[PDB]
Structure 1
Amino acid sequence: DFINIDPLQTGGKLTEEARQALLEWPPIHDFIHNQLPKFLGCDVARVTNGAREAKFAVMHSLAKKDAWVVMDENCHYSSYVAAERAGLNIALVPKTDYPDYAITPENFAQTIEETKKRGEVVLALITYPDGNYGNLPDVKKIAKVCSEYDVPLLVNGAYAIGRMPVSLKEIGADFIVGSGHKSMAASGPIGVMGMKEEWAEIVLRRSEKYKNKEVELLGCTARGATIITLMASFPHVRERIKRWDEEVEKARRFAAEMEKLGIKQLGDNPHNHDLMFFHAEVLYEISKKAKGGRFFLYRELKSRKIHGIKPGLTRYFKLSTYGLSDEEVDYVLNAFKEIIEKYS
């Protein structure tokens, strides 16, 4: 019974219904042709083999010899690699400096403008929120920026869909991506892609031969424990997003608590996400004398029914407060206090 705090898993905590559902192993059509689009607040929605898989879909789908794409400096690495695999020139829109590391809609506007000078920017993309500091840029404004520049906007909602309530039509962006195995409590490699219909005959184009298969996805009907789980949990996730406010509240408390404890949280302040990135000079000093040194932390927690931090990290690290019940939160806060006093 390990209290998990790893970001990559608090949101992908597999549902009971989906757990059982995997044992015995459908409205698939109903799902992706009704439920799903409604949930992402958008016209067309499809299920892909993961977010990065969808992110590439549209990139490959709109790329152009010597074209460009603008993505925030906090872009997940798959957003960047999948740009490369599309052969796109990539321009990063710079982040604020410590402790903000924020993606301002203004820098975006410039980046987008500076780039265009260099060529055609076939696409724009913001990681909302970035998996780094848990920062939630101002898409509503950014999406405005992109629209008054005629450069499609893809939102990497990998860390928002399945957690916080979101709607493509709300935001005003053109595309939207989600990851079922980290935010939607699903399993295996699976993802969700949403778009304005206008971009269907573009991305969702069919083969010449097999008029029924969609080329950009390889005519995949992706049946497998993947969707199975995703669907099974979906009802849960539907209701889940309602408590977002308590989740941000909680993560906020745990945050300032750490504050008093001598370790700081950078980025959004107040923060707006269970995923927070901390600076703990103290734990770094200790690590210089501490038992295992660089690993004294992992050691200390792995011995307190706690795990979720890349073992070896003491100075900087990130963590989620998502599933964590107030008591589990407190327990974790206390856990820190202890390890602090322990070493001098």
Structure 2
Amino acid sequence: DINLDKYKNLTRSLTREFINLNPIQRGGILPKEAKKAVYEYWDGPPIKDFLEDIAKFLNMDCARPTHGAREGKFIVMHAICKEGDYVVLDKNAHYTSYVAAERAKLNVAEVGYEEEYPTYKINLEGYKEVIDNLEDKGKNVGLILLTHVDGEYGNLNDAKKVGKIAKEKGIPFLLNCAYTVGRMPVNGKEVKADFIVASGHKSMAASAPCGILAFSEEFSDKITKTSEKFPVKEIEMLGCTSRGLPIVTLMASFPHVVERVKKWDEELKKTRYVVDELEKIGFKQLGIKPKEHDLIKFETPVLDEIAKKDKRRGFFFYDELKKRGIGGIRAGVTKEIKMSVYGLEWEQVEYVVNAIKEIVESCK
């Protein structure tokens, strides 16, 4: 009644045979230490000390482990805000912010762009305005969210501004550092944030659902609110035992991460190398220039032209990348491509760039 053959030859992937350009995976690649830890604990750890240390790493008062930035955002939205409260976020926000807001029965207010094409930079001051427009209508703002780096254009935002605004208005501030914590250094107190969500599998060299929620002492009682029936178990954490593979890989990759954030400018160097070298063949870097993050979005008219006549339609590029052992770009899309070379060896960066150049050169 059930075909089990689809789970037998499951042991197959191009992880070792291909170069992965997908931005959502560059920062989540396990170092060998993490792999050894996986071998050790794939069914079976100084967690408290790790929480204190990850608290210091972000310059924050307290910290808890989650199943990603998703979970953390839902946690703060569910423990701090009351049903009906508004969440004011930027227009470049991740879908999980909106969805977590909707699960917490909260409303959403967006902040416009300082400029659209091709920068798509968020008008940070606009936040202030957007708040007042809500408070004049009598609405209550419960949370101010800012995606530190968005997953579309990879733009870095001066979080200290929105921090100042949030501090003035007295509204709690959540900084979405899913694309930040683990890549670049980040000071929670310096940007005046009350909550910080980090994605372990996206930027902290961990696997599985894995994340961190850092928060100030002010809200410590609310976030870590214990249960009535069980005075030891935290309610929002659903049981303060956070065990499994992801937390192990995270703790194991922690020294690798705290060391690689000190060498963020080298990864930036790789990024800008790719951008500068690709804009020669007809690519146009979208988002803020120059790049302050590894996530790059290119507008590529050339690829669309090649896919036009004729080849295998928009799926040509993908195919032409598979021939050269490169993946991570969505198949079929040619109007624009989204890529990142974070953590790639320089020889591999050169290989990728030269590969792309050869692709556009050979396919006319």
TM-score under structure 1 normalisation?
0.97
| Alignment-derived partner of residue 35 in structure 2 | 19
The alpha-carbon deviation at position 226 of structure 1 amounts to 1.4
Partner SS for 1:278:
strand
Looking at structure 1, the residues matched to 31 and 136 of structure 2 have their Cα atoms a distance apart, in angstroms, of 49
Looking at structure 2, the residues matched to 115 and 230 of structure 1 have their Cα atoms a distance apart, in angstroms, of 40
Q: Which runs of 5+ in 1 are unaligned?
A: none
| Alignment-derived partner of residue 109 in structure 1 | 128
Q: Which of 224, 227, 232 is the equivalent residue of 1:204? A: 224
Is 2:104 aligned against 1:86? yes
Q: Which of 101, 115, 132 is the equivalent residue of 2:152? A: 132
Looking at structure 2, the residues matched to 105 and 182 of structure 1 have their Cα atoms a distance apart, in angstroms, of 25
Is 2:14 aligned against 1:3? no
Is 2:84 aligned against 1:66? yes
Looking at structure 2, the residues matched to 72 and 131 of structure 1 have their Cα atoms a distance apart, in angstroms, of 12
Q: Which runs of 5+ in 2 are unaligned?
A: 1-16
Matches within 5 A, 1:174-323: 174-323=194-343
- Give CA-to-partner distance per residue, 1:122-179, whole Å, 9 cap, x none: 0010111001100011111121122111111100000000000011012111110100
Looking at structure 1, the residues matched to 76 and 310 of structure 2 have their Cα atoms a distance apart, in angstroms, of 49
Q: Percent identity?
A: 53
- Give CA-to-partner distance per residue, 1:59-105, whole Å, 9 cap, x none: 01122232111011011100110000011110011123101101121
Looking at structure 2, the residues matched to 238 and 151 of structure 1 have their Cα atoms a distance apart, in angstroms, of 31
| Alignment-derived partner of residue 357 in structure 2 | 337
- Give CA-to-partner distance per residue, 1:104-125, whole Å, 9 cap, x none: 2122221122222231110010
Partner SS for 1:283:
helix
State whether residues 104 and 137 of structure 1, in contact with CA within 8 Å, keep that contact through their aligned partners in structure 2. Answer: no
Partner SS for 1:171:
coil
Name the aligned partner's letter for residue 46 of structure 1.
R
Looking at structure 1, the residues matched to 141 and 337 of structure 2 have their Cα atoms a distance apart, in angstroms, of 34
| Alignment-derived partner of residue 49 in structure 2 | 30
Is 2:94 aligned against 1:76? yes
Higher mean displacement: 117-126 or 51-60: 117-126
The alpha-carbon deviation at position 241 of structure 1 amounts to 0.4
Partner SS for 1:144:
helix
TM-score under structure 2 normalisation?
0.92
- Give CA-to-partner distance per residue, 1:32-58, whole Å, 9 cap, x none: 1x2111111100001012110011000
The alpha-carbon deviation at position 214 of structure 1 amounts to 0.8
Looking at structure 1, the residues matched to 131 and 28 of structure 2 have their Cα atoms a distance apart, in angstroms, of 34
| Alignment-derived partner of residue 192 in structure 2 | 172
Higher mean displacement: 310-319 or 75-84: 310-319
Name the aligned partner's letter for residue 118 of structure 2.
P
Q: How many residues align?
A: 343
Looking at structure 2, the residues matched to 208 and 109 of structure 1 have their Cα atoms a distance apart, in angstroms, of 39
The alpha-carbon deviation at position 220 of structure 1 amounts to 3.6
Looking at structure 2, the residues matched to 189 and 87 of structure 1 have their Cα atoms a distance apart, in angstroms, of 24
- Give CA-to-partner distance per residue, 1:223-271, whole Å, 9 cap, x none: 1111111111111111010110111122012112111110111112011
Looking at structure 2, the residues matched to 223 and 106 of structure 1 have their Cα atoms a distance apart, in angstroms, of 41
Name the aligned partner's letter for residue 189 of structure 1.
P
